[PDB]
From a paper:
The most common result of ROS DNA damage is the oxidation of guanine to 8-dihydro-7,8-oxoguanosine (8-oxodG) in DNA, repaired by OGG1. Here, we validate OGG1 as an anti-cancer target, which confirms targeting oxidative DNA repair as a concept for treatment of cancer.
To further understand the precise function of this inhibitor, we here determined the X-ray crystal structure of human OGG1 in complex with TH5487, showing that it binds in the active site, in an opposite orientation from the natural substrate, with the iodophenyl tail of TH5487 occupying the place of the 8-oxoguanine base. The OGG1 protein undergoes a conformational change when binding DNA, into a closed structural form. Here, we observe the benzimidazolone core interacts with a lipophilic exo-site outside the active site, stabilized by Ile152 and Leu323 in addition to a π-stacking interaction with His270. Also, the carbonyl side group of TH5487 makes a hydrogen bond with the Ile152 α-amino backbone. Finally, the bromine atom of TH5487 makes a water-mediated interaction with the side chain of Ser326. In particular, the affinity to albumin reported here, which cause more than 99% of the molecule to associate with plasma proteins is a challenge that must be solved for TH5487 to be useful for in vivo applications where OGG1 must be targeted over a long period of time to induce cell death and inhibit proliferation.
Author numbering: 11 to 284, 288 to 327
Write the structure that this text describes.
């Protein structure tokens, strides 16, 4: 079985109405939200959504989707149900045009970046995948996070399918990551101190917080409650808790502050603390600065600027 292109198997592609103004796969899938997507052919992005492999590509007005099923069933277009899982993952019910207008109307620098970086949306990620991917993100570059997440899934996620050279795994279950061998094994895969954070956080969610049920509860809770609750987990500080809140728990006002948002603040917003250096208090101020500027979807605005900085550094 090989990776499909819109050309190589036209009958196996289904279409979502979706202009490039609303979504640019090339500016979203490698922009450090999800670490699971690869451009395996020019303009074709392959990765795992909900334990199935997809390839996505786009024309001017359409998002084209194809799904590989690891069963013995005949190949077929995505069902309307499967298509809806893609629509929710890209949060296409949120119209980017109105947000881009608001952010540009209050912020000249954003206006400037936004011209070049259209269609940068926030993915709605699975909370487990989002939590453990960003535990892997601490003191780490995008290349090394992608590698660490890839090795974690290979080791502890179910094998789905092989396409050309690439073997795809689902994201590990809590049960898999709570296992007794996990920590040692993750240290062998170069996760370092993060190996223990993964094991201990999987055990803390299963044993103390009542499993997956908890992350659904946080999804339905306030930003303030969700952020506080996440911060009890080993390896989850303010930055990682904000990433999870923004990317998996529907808190669009979350502004994850680390060195990267500091660099944008100083370089592009001539910003200083009101200790001149990254601390809890100065990190909190910076987050409040961008919520005050951009409004209730501040974290979506940040995603645009992060997409730009990531692209313009390789
Ligand atoms: O912080 C995130 N992701 C993230 C994406 C969107 C939102 I909103 C919030 C966080 N992580 C993945 C990207 C990673 N990173 C680099 O390695 N270089 C970066 C540059 Br240049 C600039 C911004 C991040 C960078 C840091 C860890």
């Amino acid at each position: 079985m090989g990776h499909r292109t819109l050309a190589s198997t036209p009958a196996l592609w289904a279409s979502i109405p979706c202009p490039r103004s609303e979504l640019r796969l090339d500016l979203v899938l490698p922009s450090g939200q999800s670490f699971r997507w690869r451009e395996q052919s020019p303009a074709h992005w392959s990765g795992v959504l909900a334990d199935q492999v997809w390839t996505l590509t786009q024309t001017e007005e359409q998002l084209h989707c194809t799904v590989y099923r690891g069963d013995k069933s005949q190949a077929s277009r995505p069902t309307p149900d499967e298509l809806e899982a893609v629509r929710k993952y890209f949060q296409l019910d949120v119209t980017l045009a109105q947000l881009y207008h608001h952010w540009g109307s209050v912020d000249s620098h954003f206006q400037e970046v936004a011209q070049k970086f259209q269609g940068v949306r926030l993915l709605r990620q699975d909370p487990i995948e989002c939590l453990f991917s960003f535990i892997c993100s601490s003191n780490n570059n995008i290349a090394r996070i992608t590698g660490m997440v890839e090795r974690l899934c290979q080791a502890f996620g179910p094998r789905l399918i092989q396409l050309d050279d690439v073997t795809y795994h689902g994201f590990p279950s809590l049960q898999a990551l709570a296992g007794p061998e996990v920590e040692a094994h993750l240290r062998k895969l170069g996760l370092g101190y993060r190996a223990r954070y993964v094991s201990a956080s999987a055990r803390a969610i299963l044993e103390e917080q009542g499993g997956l049920a908890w992350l659904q509860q946080l999804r339905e809770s306030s930003y303030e409650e969700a952020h506080k609750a996440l911060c009890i987990l080993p390896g989850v500080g303010t930055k990682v808790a904000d990433c999870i809140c923004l990317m998996a728990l529907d808190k669009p006002q979350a502004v994850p502050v680390d060195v990267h948002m500091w660099h944008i603040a100083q370089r592009d917003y001539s910003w200083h603390p009101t200790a001149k250096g990254p601390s809890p208090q100065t990190n909190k101020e910076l987050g409040n600065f961008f919520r005050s500027l951009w409004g209730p979807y501040a974290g979506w605005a940040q995603a645009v600027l992060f997409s730009a900085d990531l692209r313009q550094s390789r």
